UniProtKB/Swiss-Prot annotation:
Binding partners and assembly: Part of a complex composed of NEDD9, AURKA and CTTN; within the complex NEDD9 acts as a scaffold protein and is required for complex formation. Identified in a complex with AUNIP and NIN. Interacts with FBXL7. Interacts with CPEB1, JTB, TACC1, TPX2, PPP2CA, as well as with the protein phosphatase type 1 (PP1) isoforms PPP1CA, PPP1CB and PPP1CC. Also interacts with its substrates ARHGEF2, BORA, KIF2A, PARD3, and p53/TP53. Interaction with BORA promotes phosphorylation of PLK1. Interacts with CIMAP3. Interacts with GADD45A, competing with its oligomerization.
Tissue distribution: Highly expressed in testis and weakly in skeletal muscle, thymus and spleen. Also highly expressed in colon, ovarian, prostate, neuroblastoma, breast and cervical cancer cell lines.
Phosphoserine sites (modified residues): S216
Biological function: Mitotic serine/threonine kinase that contributes to the regulation of cell cycle progression. Associates with the centrosome and the spindle microtubules during mitosis and plays a critical role in various mitotic events including the establishment of mitotic spindle, centrosome duplication, centrosome separation as well as maturation, chromosomal alignment, spindle assembly checkpoint, and cytokinesis. Required for normal spindle positioning during mitosis and for the localization of NUMA1 and DCTN1 to the cell cortex during metaphase. Required for initial activation of CDK1 at centrosomes.
One of the record's GO molecular function terms: protein heterodimerization activity
Protein family: Belongs to the protein kinase superfamily. Ser/Thr protein kinase family. Aurora subfamily.
Taxonomic placement: Eukaryota, Metazoa, Chordata, Craniata, Vertebrata
Note: Centrosome amplification can occur when the cycles are uncoupled, and this amplification is associated with cancer and with an increase in the levels of chromosomal instability.
Chief place where the protein resides: cytoplasm
Keywords assigned: ATP-binding, Cell cycle, Cell division, Cell membrane, Cell projection, Cilium, Cilium biogenesis/degradation, Cytoplasm, Cytoskeleton, Isopeptide bond, Kinase, Membrane, Microtubule, Mitosis, Nucleotide-binding, Phosphoprotein, Proto-oncogene, Serine/threonine-protein kinase, Transferase, Ubl conjugation
Boundaries of the shown chain within the full protein: 127 to 391 of 403
Protein EC: 2.7.11.1
Name of the gene: AURKA
Effect seen on changing T161E: Enhances interaction with TPX2
Name assigned to this protein: Aurora kinase A
Amino acid sequence: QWALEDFEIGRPLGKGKFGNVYLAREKQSKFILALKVLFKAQLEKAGVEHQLRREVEIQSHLRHPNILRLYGYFHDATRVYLILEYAPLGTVYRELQKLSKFDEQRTATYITELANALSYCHSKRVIHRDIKPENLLLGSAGELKIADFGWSVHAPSSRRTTLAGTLDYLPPEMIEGRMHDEKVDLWSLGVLCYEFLVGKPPFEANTYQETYKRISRVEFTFPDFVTEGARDLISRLLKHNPSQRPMLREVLEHPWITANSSKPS
Ligand SMILES: Nc1ncnc2c1ncn2[C@@H]1O[C@H](COP(=O)(O)OP(=O)(O)O)[C@@H](O)[C@H]1O
Ligand SMILES: *SCCC(=O)Nc1cccc(Cl)c1F
Ligand SMILES: [Cl-]
Ligand SMILES: [Cl-]
Ligand SMILES: [Cl-]
Ligand SMILES: [Mg+2]
Ligand SMILES: [Mg+2]
């Protein structure tokens, strides 16, 4: 139905490994959206056609306040275009660069919004597996929305797709190429909570080889300013054994979360 001629393209919004994303306006309605442009040659070479389909499958059917909407799609023989909800306050990645560190209220509120969205997905045994700040977007009232569901699978799962950039948000069972389930997202929530308070993730290292070792051996420490309550929650999430990490319900009722979040569970 939609074609490229139906849109006026504008401000570049961001670049991922595959997605080139631009502000755009539909001519007849004046509707503002984010147009995510993918190159067919690149998708084919990397073998990630199935990730494009998964992203369309999940995000086109949902209507959750903390998950980014996908409205539709079209294509033209060199490119595929995804028509996305525009997030006008940008990425959490950009916001952390701006502020350097988040206070406890902002942090606990974001973790609440993340746990609300992921609780919905886990109830369907869907695991995201790629929760990192560049994939977390902000709505007009500063509310967090999870995006980029291309890596998502139903649990339990193995891995057949090659890992890309950083290891920093992935748990031991994922980097070691073992069977995995919902608890992968709980580990990543712990990594985020640390990174939001401290300004860098807990296993950050200057080589890939060293990052891998730090993750596999769960080697992290806290700076002096991180409070007892935040240490308790992060320590519960960053457990080597997935079965020992809490359920999202238990995160949402943790005393430090309920004391500091400005949003309810
Ligand atoms: N709906 C959106 N609104 C505003 N910016 C966006 C939106 N979607 C993506 N971006 C920007 O584009 C970048 C890449 O988009 P993403 O969907 O993650 O592509 P990839 O699948 O290639 O990682 C994001 O990290 C963000 O900077
Ligand atoms: S992740 C939240 C829930 C969800 O994924 N629902 C859904 C919608 C459409 C298709 C499939 Cl497989 C789904 F799981
Ligand atoms: Cl499809
Ligand atoms: Cl350390
Ligand atoms: Cl353990
Ligand atoms: Mg991305
Ligand atoms: Mg993607």
